[PDB]
Design a protein around this nucleic acid. Structure first.
Lengths: 190, 106, 172, 136, 197
RNA sequence: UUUGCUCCACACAAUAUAGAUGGAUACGAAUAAGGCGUCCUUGUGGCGUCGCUGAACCAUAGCAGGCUAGCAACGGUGCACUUGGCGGAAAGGCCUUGGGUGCUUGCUGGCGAAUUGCAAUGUCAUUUUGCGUGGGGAUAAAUCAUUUGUAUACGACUUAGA
RNA sequence: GAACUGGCGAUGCGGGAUGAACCGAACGUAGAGUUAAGGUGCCGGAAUACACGCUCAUCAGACACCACAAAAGGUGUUAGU
């Protein structure tokens, strides 16, 4: 309908500094720094009171003001990632062959190595993205933990690990073997 | 003085024409610095010279002239219509002509 | 024909020996000129009564000028139009300074959104909305807020010359 | 430690914003925004400059950085009084935009003899400036 | 008005720039177009790549070496657009095409000459914001152009050298402006201001 | 090979022009952003200012531009000399040191112009050359024919021969 | 295969790229002006005119005759009952 003006509100906690020139947003919290390029969205950022950032679309259509809320979610995720961080938990599902998951070094890069998936002799390597930490959780059987500041990078590494363990030439609703995201939360517990 | 010009630069664009038939009796001229018919009204009646060079010296010179004059404006963008004593040779499409300031009403 | 004026057209059936002084019917017609206005008058009189141009007469045609042509008004318009597959009734709201300009906007908008040509549109009613809270379309409501103000981002400046030397800006 | 966001301010279409009409019957006169019709239309009034009160497209005008207090839908006498109270014309004339327009018009209004004085005066100033550059 | 007009092709839309250049050349103006790899086409990259593949399939069936030729370089894509807007099969069209030069990057001697823009063909002025557009260099690389990397490297070298030129130019213009301002408010300055200068 | 070839200078003759007639006047990037200036506890920093077109900037007076003395100052701008650099994307251009010399309309001075007859491009540019003049420089090859067979219908190819 | 009328045949000209029949208009030889139908980014003469909207297509669409498209569907988007 081309609304005259639409705005979204971004809350900024006390330990967080957001710098936005043009559309390059950088967020600096206690655990670290994130940077996003939003030059493809065409919005307007305006600080109010050093704890509040408004973002606005002027004379924007339906899809443009959907993208405004999308920008709000992306900046919110940056702030939440530099304050609490993101943690993704994966469980290993298998019926007969235990899936062997290890962190390995090939050449200057860490790789998540998956062995014995359905008794396969193939060895699956998933590169770990920068900022993503890998842990193997104790006191719960067959759970690997993805941890980081960027929900985008953490979730994409989780999805890479889940997608590399898809079953072929079988009925997947019977051969349910895989590595599935079981929990989507923050690093700090509260 | 480094400049001695007493004419306005112009470009011979084409003949008067429809899509597939041209009329060589009328030439279309673009005058430098003219963008509207209102501005082009200034130059109506001004003499135009096309100056060109030949190898053979004719009458004490090797550079020959074709005279004409601005008759009316053409279109919305300052192009004018011109007629010459002999029609311009159509190899001059894109060549430079000189629109003089005489006859002067100013 | 969107150089629209409004005319009052008053006409009647031709007086007869048995019925002198017929009932003097009147219409408000938006049209480009008086000839089209009289045509529209007879078109609507034929379509609502048993009176054709041959058996009647135009008693008066007068152009109606907007009483306050320089104050912003909210207009509610009722139309009936013909689509490709049927007839429909429609209500629209136009914010503008005069009735004729509202009706011009109406014809342009119906052409743009419904491909409805002038032939295919009957303007049932054009009435000023007396006050807010009677406006019902958000595209008019959103311009009626308090202390309205908006920018015009991305200004595009017309260039009179073919080449510019400066790689221009869109600031505004 | 301080959050920073580059504002990227614009001239705003609001009641009381001073516009410069760039094409039409007025074509270079200031007017005031009286009320907003829609996204592309406003009502303007230019009583000081003799611009008729009219509804105009925003593509016919260019907003100036000037603004003055004016109630929505104010009539022509009210606009005149508020324009005089805010001294809009002087604030415009003090701007480099207005002096640029005045200076282009003055250049267009020069005669051939005046252009000759412009040439000689420019040569003299150039001589002194070139001495200053040589000393610098 | 210049004897040669050098057009910075970066940010222009290919067809509108082609139409402008074709009319210029036909009216007898010499044009050099630089940075053809930074031209723009409206529409998404995949759409324009599909269009170029549809171009690529057209060839003389019985001998492909005589069929339509499929030039991959950005400068030759723009030259192809200029043809079709010039009647190239005539002597006048050949003369108008001989008045033209198109380059990737800005080679000498044009690297030390002023570049202009054509605002009626500028994407930033012409395309509605939020509309997708294609970059000619990446499209050319995708359809088989070989020299995008060497052009980018060599353009980076030219840009650093140009930046040094501009820093020197800033110093000189600041000096000139300060000395002009010092010589202002003199008798000649007053009189020139009265005359409009 | 009618004492050949080539390169600078030079006056001559031709030549033929897709079209000179003050100057193609150099950041990069962004455009829901930037340029410039200034300041600092050097940043994605504060502050100010600008744009709304090159309608600008530079240049621009003098028989198509002739003849001359100074004044503050050591400027401006050509021509050869010269010092060093930088530039390989198609560099073939850009910058700079110093002296010599011409002009200077920055200002004040001194003479001339006509009859092209009331206009006539009223000839001022840029190519390619051939003939001379006077200085410098260099002092071969290829093909046919013969020969080979890694080649080959013929041409072509591949070898050899003072 | 019939009816009425207008055409082509027997007819060039401007327009529909192209074409017997469509649109416009019918023709001695020329000059000037104005137009028809059709157009005015470039080819290509003529506004990259002005104005209000709609549409983004990983087979867009783009002018009558005319060089095709349907039933049926879509929280694509826009108006409306």
């Amino acid at each position: 309908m081309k609304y005259i003006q639409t705005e979204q509100q971004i809350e900024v906690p006390e330990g967080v500094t957001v710098s936005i020139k043009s559309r390059i947003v950088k967020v600096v919290g206690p655990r670290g720094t994130l940077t996003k390029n939003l030059k493809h969205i065409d919005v307007t950022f305006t600080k109010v009171n050093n704890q509040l950032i408004k973002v606005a679309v002027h004379n924007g259509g339906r899809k443009h003001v959907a993208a405004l809320r999308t920008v709000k979610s992306l900046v919110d995720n940056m702030i939440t990632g530099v304050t609490k961080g993101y943690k993704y938990k994966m469980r290993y599902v298998y019926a007969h062959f235990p899936i062997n998951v290890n962190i390995v070094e090939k050449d200057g890069a860490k790789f998540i190595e998956v062995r014995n998936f359905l008794g396969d002799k193939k060895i699956r390597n998933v590169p770990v993205r920068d900022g993503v930490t890998i842990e193997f959780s104790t006191n719960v059987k067959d759970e690997i933990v993805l941890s980081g500041n960027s929900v985008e990078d953490v979730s994409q590494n989780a999805a890479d690990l889940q997608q590399i363990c898809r079953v072929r030439n079988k009925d997947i609703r019977k051969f349910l073997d895989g590595i599935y995201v079981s929990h989507k939360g923050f690093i700090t517990e509260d | 003085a480094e400049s001695h010009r007493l004419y306005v630069k112009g470009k011979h664009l084409s003949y008067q024409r429809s899509k597939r038939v041209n009329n060589p009796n009328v030439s279309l001229i673009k005058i430098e610095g003219v963008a509207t018919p209102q501005d082009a009204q200034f130059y109506l009646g001004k003499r135009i010279a096309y100056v060109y060079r030949a190898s053979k010296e004719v009458r004490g010179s090797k550079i020959r002239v074709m005279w004409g004059k601005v008759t009316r404006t053409h279109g919305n963008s300052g192009v004018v219509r011109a007629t010459f004593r002999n029609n311009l040779p159509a190899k001059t499409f894109g060549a430079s002509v000189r629109i003089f300031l005489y006859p002067s009403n100013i | 024909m969107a150089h629209f004026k409004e005319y009052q057209v008053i006409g009647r059936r031709l007086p007869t020996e048995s019925v002198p002084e017929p009932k003097l019917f009147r219409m408000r017609i938006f049209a480009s000129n008086e000839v089209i206005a009289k045509s529209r008058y007879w078109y609507f009189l034929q379509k609502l009564h048993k009176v054709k141009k041959a058996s009647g007469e135009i008693v008066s045609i007068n152009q109606i000028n907007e009483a306050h042509p320089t104050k912003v008004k909210n207009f509610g318009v009722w139309v009936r139009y013909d689509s490709r597959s049927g007839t429909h009734n429609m209500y629209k709201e136009i914010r503008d300074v005069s009735r004729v300009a509202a009706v011009e906007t109406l014809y342009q908008d119906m052409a743009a959104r419904h491909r409805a040509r002038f032939r295919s549109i009957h303007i049932l009613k054009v009435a000023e909305i007396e006050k807010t809270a009677d406006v019902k379309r958000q595209y008019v409501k959103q311009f009626l807020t308090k202390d309205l103000k908006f920018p015009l981002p991305h200004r595009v400046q017309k260039s009179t010359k073919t080449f510019s030397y400066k790689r221009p800006s869109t600031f505004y | 430690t301080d959050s920073i966001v580059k504002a990227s301010n614009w001239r705003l279409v609001e009641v009381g914003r001073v516009v410069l009409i760039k094409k039409g019957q007025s074509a270079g006169k200031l007017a005031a925004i009286v009320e907003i019709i829609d996204q592309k239309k406003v009502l303007i009034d230019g009583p000081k400059a003799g611009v008729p009160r009219q509804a105009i497209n925003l593509g016919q005008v260019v907003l100036t950085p000037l603004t003055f207090a004016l109630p929505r839908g104010a009539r022509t006498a009210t606009v005149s009084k508020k324009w005089a109270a805010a001294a809009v014309c002087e604030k415009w004339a003090a701007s480099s935009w207005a002096k640029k327009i005045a200076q282009r018009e003055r250049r267009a209004a020069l005669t051939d003899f005046e252009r000759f004085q412009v040439m000689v005066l420019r040569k003299q100033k150039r001589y002194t400036v070139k001495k200053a550059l040589a000393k610098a | 008005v210049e004897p040669v007009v050098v057009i910075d092709g970066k940010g222009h839309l290919v067809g509108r720039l082609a139409s402008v250049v074709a009319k210029q050349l036909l009216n007898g103006q010499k044009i050099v177009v630089v940075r053809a790899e930074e031209l723009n086409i409206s529409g998404e990259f995949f759409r324009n790549k599909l269009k170029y593949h549809d171009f690529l399939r057209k060839a003389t069936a019985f001998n492909k070496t005589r069929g339509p030729f499929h030039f991959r370089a950005p400068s030759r894509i723009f030259y192809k657009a200029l043809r079709g807007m010039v009647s190239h099969k005539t002597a006048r069209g050949k003369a108008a095409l001989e008045r033209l030069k198109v380059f990737e990057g800005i080679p000498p001697p044009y690297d030390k000459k002023k570049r202009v823009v054509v605002p009626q063909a500028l994407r930033v002025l012409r395309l509605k914001p939020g509309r997708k557009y294609t970059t000619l260099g990446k499209l050319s690389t995708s359809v088989g152009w070989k020299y995008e990397d060497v052009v980018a490297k060599l353009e980076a070298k030219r840009k650093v050298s140009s930046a040094e030129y501009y820093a020197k130019k800033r110093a000189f213009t600041k000096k000139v402006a300060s000395a002009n301002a010092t010589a202002a408010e003199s008798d000649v300055a007053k009189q020139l201001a009265a005359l409009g200068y």
